[PDB]
């Protein structure tokens, strides 16, 4: 049994898989090899397979801000990207955002289009950021040492120091 790699396919015998860009049309026999037929126009198959039909290419919806980076072939799917300077939300680039924001407890290090998405940092001790923002940096804690004020409430990465007398 066992069956070799990049050949795989077992069913009383060991058959060769179809090369990427080819669908499976007929199984192999004792004396005949596996029969594979190429994928049709607008269709693909990206791996050594035993698939009887090819998959359709994904479309880069202009209304989603998508633009085709690489036209799909019979072995690879269409690769999409954003308009620029729009940024992909996933590695798959299935949606675009102008830029990402930095949630409370995080501050910005800017967004300059073309790979340059917002760089966030986690607010060091003595700094805070309430609000979700794509421009706001971490702000420093009040003082409570200026007018020789108290301290009253600690001060978080999300909240500021609150002071009395």
């Amino acid at each position, epitope marked *: 049994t066992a069956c070799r790699e990049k050949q795989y396919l077992i069913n009383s015998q060991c058959c060769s898989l179809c090369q990427p860009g080819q669908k499976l049309v007929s199984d192999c026999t004792e004396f005949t090899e596996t029969e594979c037929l190429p994928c049709g126009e607008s269709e693909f198959l990206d791996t050594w397979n035993r698939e009887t039909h090819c998959h359709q290419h994904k479309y880069c919806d202009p209304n989603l801000g998508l633009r085709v980076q690489q036209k799909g072939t019979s072995e690879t799917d269409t690769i999409c990207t954003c308009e*620029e300077g729009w940024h992909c939300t996933s590695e798959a680039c299935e949606s675009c955002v*102008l*830029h990402r*924001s930095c949630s409370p407890g995080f501050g910005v290090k800017q967004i300059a289009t073309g790979v340059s998405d917002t760089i966030c940092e986690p607010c060091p001790v003595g700094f805070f950021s309430d*609000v979700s923002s*794509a421009f706001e940096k971490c702000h420093p804690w009040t003082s409570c040492e200026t007018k020789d004020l108290v301290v009253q409430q600690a001060g978080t990465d999300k909240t500021d120091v609150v002071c009395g007398p």
Partner: nanobody, 116 residues
Framework: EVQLLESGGGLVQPGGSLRLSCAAS???????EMWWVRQAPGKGLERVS?????????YYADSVMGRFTISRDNSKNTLYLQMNSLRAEDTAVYYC?????????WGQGTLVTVSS
């Protein structure tokens, strides 16, 4: 449901000034961070300015600092951009964007042309 309707954009002479507005509807405008972005024809997308919900904190691009002013009327649910000392580089289509800045979270645009 988000509608952002830019206006104020027209043909102005260099050195001149314009006031752009973005009328928001379909969301609680007073609670969202807003941005102004411009796109020159052919040339790249550029982030001009940004404002926090209360209108107390702002950001400006180095290329527009000192000449441009972002502001908001949370009663009327409108965002503004006062453009002064206008130059030909400022010729672009101006858009306004709503956080979380999806391709659905921005307007139709308003054309600003700076020439003689």
């Amino acid at each position: 449901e988000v509608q952002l309707l830019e206006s104020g954009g027209g043909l102005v002479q260099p050195g001149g000034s314009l006031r752009l507005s973005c009328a928001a509807s379909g969301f609680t405008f007073r609670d969202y961070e807003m941005w102004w972005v411009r796109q020159a024809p052919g040339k790249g997308l550029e982030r001009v300015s940004a404002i926090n919900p209360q209108g107390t904190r702002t950001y400006y691009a180095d290329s527009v600092m000192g000449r441009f002013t972002i502001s908001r009327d949370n009663s009327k649910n409108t965002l503004y951009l006062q453009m002064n000392s206008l130059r030909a580089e400022d010729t672009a289509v101006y858009y306004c964007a709503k956080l979380p800045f999806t391709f659905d979270d921005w307007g139709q645009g308003t054309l600003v042309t700076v020439s003689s």
